Design a binder for this molecule. Sequence first.
Ligand code: A1ISP
Lengths: 280, 1132, 381
Amino acid sequence: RPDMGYNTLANFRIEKKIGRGQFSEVYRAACLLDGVPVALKKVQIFDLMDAKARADCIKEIDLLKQLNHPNVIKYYASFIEDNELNIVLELADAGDLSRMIKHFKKQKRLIPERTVWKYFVQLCSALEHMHSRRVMHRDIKPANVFITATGVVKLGDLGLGRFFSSKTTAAHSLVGTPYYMSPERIHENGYNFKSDIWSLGCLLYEMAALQSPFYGDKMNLYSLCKKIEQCDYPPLPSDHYSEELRQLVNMCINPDPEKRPDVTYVYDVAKRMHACTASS
Amino acid sequence: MSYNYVVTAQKPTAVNGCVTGHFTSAEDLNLLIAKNTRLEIYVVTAEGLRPVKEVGMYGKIAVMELFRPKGESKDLLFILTAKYNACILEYKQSGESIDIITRAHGNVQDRIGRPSETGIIGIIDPECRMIGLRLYDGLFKVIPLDRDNKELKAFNIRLEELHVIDVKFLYGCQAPTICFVYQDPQGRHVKTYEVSLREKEFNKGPWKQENVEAEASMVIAVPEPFGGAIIIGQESITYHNGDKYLAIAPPIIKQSTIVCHNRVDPNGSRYLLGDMEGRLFMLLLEKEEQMDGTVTLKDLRVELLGETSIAECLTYLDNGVVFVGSRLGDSQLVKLNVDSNEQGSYVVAMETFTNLGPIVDMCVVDLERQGQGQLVTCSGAFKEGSLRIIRNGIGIHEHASIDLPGIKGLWPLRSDPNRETDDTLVLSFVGQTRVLMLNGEEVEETELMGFVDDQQTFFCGNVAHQQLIQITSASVRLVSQEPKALVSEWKEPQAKNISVASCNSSQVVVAVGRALYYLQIHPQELRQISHTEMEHEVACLDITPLGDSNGLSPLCAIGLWTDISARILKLPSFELLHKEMLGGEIIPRSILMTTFESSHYLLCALGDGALFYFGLNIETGLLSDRKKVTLGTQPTVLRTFRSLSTTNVFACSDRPTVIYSSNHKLVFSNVNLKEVNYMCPLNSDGYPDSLALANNSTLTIGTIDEIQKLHIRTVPLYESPRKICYQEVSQCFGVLSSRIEVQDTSGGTTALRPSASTQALSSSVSSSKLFTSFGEEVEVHNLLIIDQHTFEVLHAHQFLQNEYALSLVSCKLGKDPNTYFIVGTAMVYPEEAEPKQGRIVVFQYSDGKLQTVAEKEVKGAVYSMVEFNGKLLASINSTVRLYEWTTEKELRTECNHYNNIMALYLKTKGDFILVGDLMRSVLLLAYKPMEGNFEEIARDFNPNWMSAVEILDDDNFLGAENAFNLFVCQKDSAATTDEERQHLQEVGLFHLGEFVNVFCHGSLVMQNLGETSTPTQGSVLFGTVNGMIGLVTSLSESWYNLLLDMQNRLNKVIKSVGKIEHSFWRSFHTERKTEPATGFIDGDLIESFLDISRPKMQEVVANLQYDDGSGMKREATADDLIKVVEELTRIH
Amino acid sequence: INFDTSLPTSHTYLGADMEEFHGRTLHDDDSCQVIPVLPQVMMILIPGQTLPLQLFHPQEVSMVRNLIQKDRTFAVLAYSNVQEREAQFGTTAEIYAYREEQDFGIEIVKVKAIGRQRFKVLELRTQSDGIQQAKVQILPECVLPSTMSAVQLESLNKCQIFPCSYKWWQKYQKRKFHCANLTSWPRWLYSLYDAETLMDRIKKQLREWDENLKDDSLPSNPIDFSYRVAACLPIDDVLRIQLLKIGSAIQRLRCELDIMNKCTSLCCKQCQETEITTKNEIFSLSLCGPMAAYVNPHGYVHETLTVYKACNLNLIGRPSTEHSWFPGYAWTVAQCKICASHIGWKFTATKKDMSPQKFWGLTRSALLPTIPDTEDEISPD
Ligand SMILES: CCN[C@@H]1CC[C@H]2CC[C@@H]1N2c1ccc2c(c1)C(=O)N([C@H]1CCC(=O)NC1=O)C2=O
């Protein structure tokens, strides 16, 4: 029904399934009014969260509605239908950041330093957008950093999956290894704006060394906490990356959130540095 | 709730049809005329035009023509109304009762049909067997003429041709053939038929179609012997008889299209043509061909005769006299002398019928006399622009003014035997009587030896038998003519004094004390033949000669001081002729026997302001004729002077009340004079037919005006009048004019003829720097300023090129000491459909010049400009805009309001605003100074064309709409829900039968309180394109309930011309719906109740229940209606 | 522009030709009627326009089947506010073309409808089955005689029929409104309320959007030409409502002629500030005009306005023929740069020989006319 436009299931035609989380499922589809590719995120709130938890989730979703930036996935609409909160976003099927990281790992070739700063500044701009409006991400990782063939970086999965998992903190150890855990999150001190930059620093190191800062073969969650608390990670090479690249990740990957600087400091460094290698 | 009342203060004056025939009987040359509803039949005679009859036509006339059937000794008439009421008349006079009885009548309109574009054309069969009417397109209405069809029952003949411009029946045909020119995509063709009654259809004609001039307009069926038909176009004329075909190309017809035609010869050897501009063309047909005794055409020579008024319907009266009927000019009467050639014209004007239409804008004002309105209107069109200054009264122009300390008595004296002209006008002071010598300009007081000086003159005049009687209050000292010696001096035997010295042509009867005796002026002597005394003192003595004899007075009527009654008794005896019941308290002031129209009358003017109008019997006895029309409220005197070959008796009073009878009923044309105490005719050698206005301020002498109901002035402008506004302080008017100027090959435009704008004493051209082909016409708009006394154009203001002036307002704004002339121009361009840059310009008349002390620039076009309580409310395009006149003299916009419609009309009262567009979208806005912004209350929308609108009171709004109708609107204040408060209710429906252009608030009477107020409230007047100036004034619920319940009772007795009912005539007219007229009262029908006959007044009222003052009084006699109906007639 | 503009009018995108009906149905003026209402119709249907529908709900197919044997006339409520199904006026539409197809085992009908008469609804009742029946009071189409009829001289009536058109139009005012010197109003004003002059000024603008000739396509009747313009006007819902209530076509032409004048700029309806296209860039691709009602493969129309250049759009997707409304044309989907609404598609020519190459297909339901500068949108008459 065009009267509500993007706000009904009958307008949309489901093609296949592209994602399946613990609580929510991600699909790629289109709408028989425009055909625009989208990202449908279906969750069953009636069976997972109480009435109180829905108010905060709805209010946070309303904050993401105002999030309008080319470097961030645009929010089309959010609605409830068939006892499911259906959320439609901008579909980015060209791949994610972790795809080329694995690709360069297969090639066994270190990603050029000039290339790293080309898109990291774009991600910093995306991180600046929701941090300026008092919105956190909680899921900053190469998995939800998508790039098209044009070289434009979008940041998706704005913590929607992590909002429903707040009651299943112990369940994070059975589905994947959370290499991007912040010291304030594991200690159950609560999530803050310093956790996003902590993941960004872990993201920035992974983009250079093609590995997680706290990666380990046959490594258990207790061992992950010790490395995170001690910030024990292999040093980045100096011949391929300058001091500014290594110094920037030092502050972001810090046990103390207060020491970690603000996004404006990182974004300003992102703009100045990338311009140097653009003409180099 | 409106409960209104509409009367006609001026009948229509512009004609829409004019014919000639023998209507009254066989040997007459009638000139029938129909202006709009006034069928004014005449009789043409060598003396001129002699009026015969005018009738009440209940409908808008459009077709009129005189046709004589076979077996009938005089022409009949065909009458068809714009409402399609058709009736055929028949003049008839039975001794005196001239009755235009109707042979046939009926309606000839059909259920469904689209009225044609070229209007309605009605023509008759020259054999008088067919009525040819083209009402709707693609359908011909024909009716068989016979005794059986007295209802005008119709049969129809389907036409397979849509366009038909002009259709005429043909001459010289065995069966009636019609010849018409009609437009088709191929071209203009002239085709015919043979209408037959036996098959009720059409048949083949005498010839086929022809390709003719691209602008062929009308046919003119030439009569026998030629036959056939002539077709006139914009370019050339042609002749179409079948085999024959002639056509000439005259170069002098190219100026304008030929519109009006007339035949000035019974055999068609000549024709009379007239164009739009109103110039005369002589079309001649030559029968020079003579085959074997039969004659046919040789050429179609066309001549130019002269320039007349802009013509609508021409007509030839015998001896070369033509009535040039007009609608937007002055109807004329011109002799077509064939040897004149004085400058190139065969035309010289004899008569002129004053024409009020077209009235565009008017302002009710008080030029001279305060408290009375003298309406000024803008009339005419193109070259015939003129001002119709209507006034309701008959004034006097005093040619002399001599200061007299309260002249108590004046009378003419002729101390000159064999003179036949006034010589002396002796005055009468409080205790003195000065005798003045007045032959030419002499005003010296010369006392004769045969007359005393220390007495109060009561009768100083001339009698036969060579005796001059100068009767004073002391004694009658009769003087002589040649010796001027006192032949006799009849003194009172007891030294008594006469209260008033009354006398006749050959007898003098005074009232000395309480006794009355007659003392005729015996030849060179004086003696008394009677002596008697009445019961009471004779306050008023009146012994004046009757008709014939001229030597004695058959009857004398007197007043009794102790009885206040009319005492009539024989002159040589004391037997009482009659006694009048009417009269009491205040004694009568003057008594006279009046012979208006050879009918004896006697009005008893009292000293308190009551005139007991009545008759008398010269032979024996007297009547009562109970009627007291108030001739003022001050002491009066009845003095009669002829000066016009009729009675012409006028009673002086604080207001001058004149007693004139139109035909047999007195019409009190209340005169215009300061204060008339006593009246005496000054028929001096230097004062022919003049009079001496004896007032208490200064003794004046002069000539009075005619006995006319509404004296209408006129001043020529020679350019179209658009708008007018009255400005009191500057002593002038403001008028908008548009003179057509010809675009030549010079970069400028030359004036066609001199006009008011061209010939104004001062001209100014606007120089605003804030922002073609040859032979084309371009309007130039002007603001003309004209004085109210002499109506001389004092300043013509020339606007910018291609600048249109739409709105006129005169007012003083804000907080300034000088008033302003403010006009709003609207620059319109042929490319730009809707104008986009108007203007507002400030003028202020002072010291003989019009200057632009302020100026405003706007983006649009202004349409209406009122003064909203010190601030100007200009509606630009479709945004009704306010302003605030500031201290820097520059308009500043304060509030705006953007309308869903085009703000064309603007009428404000108090703090309300009325807005309307050209399609009856009436809007009501309220200003809220507590917020500084406009608002809306109710909003009524209806699709219909609207001519002009006016607000009646705080709740009632009136306007004139399409299809000749009047409507009122009213918003109910008791709306329990705002949805009803957002609606303007309608309660007024009325077919005015006219097309209003302007409404104005005022009246043409002397504004009188009446102590107990008046039935009417408010006074609004409306003009028209014909000139039917009228009046609608609100009424009470019970006043309107009485009038309505008796107007319905009028129509059951009084019959109309054509048996057209009043319900049908007045009903609401729209192209799609008809509704009975409600909430309006017809004053013209109501005033016509007076002239009805006495036994019919008994049938009018039988269960009326008139009185509401503590008792219905269902009888209501007959005079109770005359108490109210006469009261109504005083509002105009 | 070699598109053969007759193609969108034929509606060849709906499959085989529908069954045509020859009978014409009309209701009396001011009459009290009962008419069915289509539950899933939201278009402001101007009478004189053909509206094609595809029905998927069984009730809709059942409703039309009942009407097929009946007069084949149904109402189109012009919902001023669509959320609460509130309607104050409407339009009675007739059905002349329909076709039933048993696609995928279900009965699907594709029906063309023609609107005839505007009307006023007095009561909104819903039956037990869920089908809406509306009380009908037909607005009478007021016919107005010329504004010079009552003030015309009966003698000059023979000059009122007539045989560089600017000089001819100058010669049309000076010979039909010559009697303006009797009344208070000028010549040029009287023409502004005359039908035969408004349609001239409307044709002038339309020729800037189409290369057709006025004699054949654009009608001569003032009533017909009034509804024809209103339907083919690129306007929103609100501006098209006021053109449905107006009773006399003389007012409607003045309102539309003002709509086409002031509304020089267009913006999205969810932004009210993001310009999308203008009126000069509009060009015609159908005999109905640039505007032509197409239906999406699931009973969903898409009035579309083809313009040369459109801005503030971000291109999504790849050119797919799928159900290309313009034959031979693929398209690239675009959405609003700010409010993320669906503005319209960008069509591209797969064949280089045919013209035009690129033209934007914008649905009407997401465009808002807007006066430039800063002033309220007012439509006189
Ligand atoms: C039915 C499946 N379809 C495909 C899978 C869904 C999505 C993505 C590709 C394609 N698709 C469309 C969705 C909506 C529409 C169209 C395709 C389409 O073509 N239109 C219009 C507009 C263009 C045109 O000119 N004519 C149309 O019919 C739609 O509304």
